Symmetry: C5
Subunit: 315 residues, 5 copies
């Protein structure tokens, strides 16, 4: 996830363009056109203004990393919902634990149906709905009701409607004994369902393409002025601030490390759900929230220790 | 949606103003006034300070793109409301499903009445209330009660009041069986109704016109210093840092690409509801939220699969 | 609301100070003190650093426009409250509609009592409480209970207490039939009452006076260096980068347009409730929210169309 | 509260250090060490870079004024709680109004116990708990239960626990008739109690001391380069851009006005609860919220005018 | 916690690299390679641009200190939960106070299980679950149910599920007499449980490693240009702006104090839960919230003073 694995495709390209026009400057650039080349090394360095290109990167990247962080906070986690389903949806019997496992499956299913439409790392795991059936998130007969819906949009909201038709059926049977308990379930669904709704909206509406193009112009307009205006010309010709020939442009690479590396921060955070190294481990999070929910609402329902005293009960 | 479709109206204008004063400088600008012109190429370049004009664009555009993003988050979506109406408003009969379809129509109607007053792409689809009647959002007799209201303001809030008079009538008939269920409906209306209220307020109160005018001065004060202070004068006259004649101002266009392109980000995001390419697809969102609501509260009400076991029921 | 109506009081002042010390420089400034004046045109231009003065304006104005926008979002609007009073407070009779009109009057009254203490445009409309009685927001006998309160603070919170004593009286008589309905009323009052509380606090605590004074020093320290360090001296004396005499300082006015215009953004947004052109139209908003509330809770209570089918009922 | 009362302790110090090394430069600095002094006026001015010191102040002060504003928004105000206690806690009798006055005293007491631990202006008013007893916020026998708690931490949360033991006792006696009314009281306590909890946390965790020290280095590293690199040396020695002797460094004080004044914004906002002029008037707010609460829940409980018609009842 | 304890490891290193190449420049650098060294002191100072390195630090550190502050606000505090458990969970008997102490132990336990996985200062206090048993947060038999859960993830959420199975058992026995009281408990758990969930997510997702590497390049690319381009060469050779020899680079250390000290702000705030001096005192907060919760829900339950009159009861 470091800078050396992203920049080396552009680093060997920058050495391949710099020293090719520097070594051939000594021999292939003849004296009738070497004089034509000395007029540019004080020209391209004149308009090479490195404050506004460092300015436009600063306000663009902090727009991205604020948007990249807000994409992470709206990750669909069922952890705030598994504490309500184990609290409210009751019953030790076969039907009672079948409600709690199904209700958390619908929340786990509707986090898969949105993450397979925004993450390439999840879509390579669930390419079709047959792979969501065989994983265990959707049953065989819920795939018939899913695919017989006349809708040409994304159908990630469908299990969040099956949640409400199931939580209202548990209320009618008395497995949600209270009435604020039933309101608490639908309150904590719409917080979860809005978290799936934000990830659809950060994917639908991106950072604007022209503002991505303006910063990409400015960095790649700088590296054309830097490519020519910081060339090592002949020392014996007696120019202003030019009587040396390092024959290796050692410092200007450190301004390619830093300017293009600043832009490469914004490149891999413009769509952080991909197969990068600093991506959100979404396939880790799908297997996590599906495992710990079926642990919490099924094998931890009303399984408590004895109410025994504390160590500090009278100390 | 790229930068080449917005800037070319100003790009051919900038070549038409630069080289017209550069080609006629050699011939039409005679020697008695060529000497008058050489006094300006070191003068307009002296006060051409490109750090503060790049400064004022940075803080202005990030005000816009934060306001442009906050305009998008307050888009009226009925998705958080269709999970409550299918959960609470009950009844399989003719009257029961007529409540759920009407209640989501009033939310869909009151998202149209505000988006046709803030979006030009929606107002070209619904120019009059007769086009909202014929689309299906308002019935023929709800248009009589709409137009017989003595109000000279925007009447987008009217279906959100019809929502409350209908949801309180469903409660009195027992189709909202609970009491926290009825409170949950009016709670999730005022979240939706405030989302319509924000879009009226981002439209009513804009980015201030003087702050739009300050940045427009600074960019167009720079391109008058750049138009004269970066002219290619004669090489044989022996000036400071001027003994070349490219005859094509190749780099200064790359500072017109980037400065005016930075401002053009703020131009098309100052009113993102128009007919641009990176606009919010509001006509897509109106047809989406009206279709998937009448799917969710009518054809998906209490239509569940059998409660069948998971694949991981004992694994 | 443009920049030409705010800056012209300082624009004629800047021409009156620039060319007065430029035209009298040629004639009134004699040669024994013309030599004393040439020592300053390369001195005041030396310390004329235009990056930090453009820096301090950038972080100060974006503090203001974020505070100016947050002042607007806390505007007291009764629109979120008129949907609850028409939903919960019932009764078609004389007493029942007298509850709904009074309850929305108290919310409309307590938005006037705070906006007449923060807006000069409202205080010129309601100079005394007799003008709030004659407008119709406070009755004749509620002015006796208002003025017989031993309190030396602002009494904007008084109608929000009359709201709670009335909404608890409607609950005791059964005109609020439910119990979550009564909780929903007091929940949506404290959201409204905190909106009146924020406007009292943005008015009580301002942008700090020293931080307003630091930016006002820096702009007016720049325009003393610009007033002298950018003077047009004699061309025939042979100075560095000075052999011209435009006799009209055309570009330096474009740095007065932009620096002082940037500060004038922060001047008219430091108290946006005044009588400016880009002010919040508070007198428009007071007449709006008082009209559409008495329309919504009185003439639209339980006045619905027939529940008739949609156009898409089986399509 | 202006800049002239904070900077004059450093302004007379800056004149006392500048002209002491300028007047003694002409006479006490002899010619063998005057030549040693001319090597520094072009050296200290060389590294005197005023863009990064203006940079580090910009991002540091806007961290402070955002934290200073967030300290103000978490001020403990009982105004959102006095509308619930007058609404829910009932009874016209002696015991009924003794509940409402005590419940708002506990909220008023627990705003004093935290503000006397974060404000020096309140701690000079309440130095001991005996001064909180004699002011009237804590009774004589609640001081016995307060001081007999084995706790070595701050005990500001103690009246917020007495609030819950009293509001649950009013519910058991039927003076809170409803059940959502009792939930609304404890909901609006934890909003108030978190407001007292934030002020303890802005006081406990400050702006980091190293980041306060970095900006203090940079400003006071600038004023050592400015103290020497902008000295007025002899005009007759013929240096670069130095042939004048104003004998009064008039412009460099305007860069001490602005750089040190920018830092002095962050000095008096790093702890805004002190005895400054732009402090939050906390002793005004303690006497305000204690007076208007005992007015609202005691002398305004169920004291309404007659329900009389509006001026616009049929117009 | 100051800057002198962090920078001295790099401060003695910077003197050890500067004057080693300055003292040996006079003697060890012979005249055939002293001429080779004079070509670099005007070269490394040429590309030493200190505005963009001060730029990239500004936007990076304010990302950190906003993330460092948001890490602090999501600290798990049981103070908002101890007011609900003393209010709702009733009973003076042995079983009744055993519910309140256990319910606040589970909140105190689930703040330890997450802080021992994000703080090194807590993990050195609780290295194993046997040290959480012996401290008193987990009983001997709750450690059997904890370690017999088939889960390979972090099990910090386990006591928040034991909270819901206990709060639903107290409701079934009538120790939570109401129904909104039971909803208020699970509402204020999910606020607390999300606070533990954020600290797991600020630890799981950090500031991106490439953006940490870009700023570390730019500072350490500056201090190679500063190490050579600001060397004190011989005065008698007659170079541009170089005829002095301080023999102690006094000002350039003040740009190492400030640039590296700015980065050291971001170094110790990138993981503020460690054993630093400005860390969050988490071991103070664990002992605080465990002590004051067992004080508030056990020894302060229904222990009130007599309802006695105020000092201002008729004044
Ligand atoms: Cl509720």
């Amino acid at each position: 996830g470091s800078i050396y694995k992203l920049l080396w495709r552009e680093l060997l390209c920058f050495l391949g363009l710099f020293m090719a026009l520097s070594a051939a400057y000594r021999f292939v650039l003849t004296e009738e056109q070497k004089r034509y080349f000395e007029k540019l090394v004080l020209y391209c360095d004149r308009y090479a203004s490195l404050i506004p290109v460092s300015f436009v990167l600063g306000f663009y990247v902090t727009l991205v990393v604020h948007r990249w962080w807000n994409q992470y906070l709206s990750m669909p986690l069922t952890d705030a919902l598994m504490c309500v389903v184990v609290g409210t949806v009751h019953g030790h019997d076969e039907r009672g634990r079948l409600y709690r496992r199904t209700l958390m499956r619908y929340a786990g299913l509707s986090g898969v149906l949105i993450l397979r439409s925004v993450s390439t790392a999840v879509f390579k795991r669930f390419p079709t709905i047959d792979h969501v059936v065989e994983a265990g998130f959707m049953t065989r007969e819920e795939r018939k009701k899913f695919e017989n819906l006349n809708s040409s949009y994304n159908k990630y909201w469908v299990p969040c409607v099956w949640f409400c038709n199931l939580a209202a059926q548990a209320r009618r049977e008395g497995r949600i004994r209270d009435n604020g308990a039933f309101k608490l379930l639908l309150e904590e669904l719409n917080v979860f369902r809005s978290k799936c709704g934000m990830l659809f909206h950060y994917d639908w509406i991106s950072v604007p393409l022209v503002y991505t193009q303006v910063v990409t112009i400015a960095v790649y307009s700088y590296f054309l002025a830097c490519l020519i205006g910081r060339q090592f010309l002949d020392p014996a010709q007696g120019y202003k601030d030019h009587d040396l020939d390092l024959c290796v442009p050692i410092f200007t690479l450190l301004q390619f490390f830093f300017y293009a590396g600043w832009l490469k921060v914004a490149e891999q955070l413009i769509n952080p759900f991909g197969e990068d190294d600093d991506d959100f481990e979404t396939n880790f999070l799908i297997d996590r929230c599906f495992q710990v929910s079926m642990l919490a609402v099924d094998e931890m329902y009303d399984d408590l220790a004895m109410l025994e005293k504390d160590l500090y009960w009278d100390a």
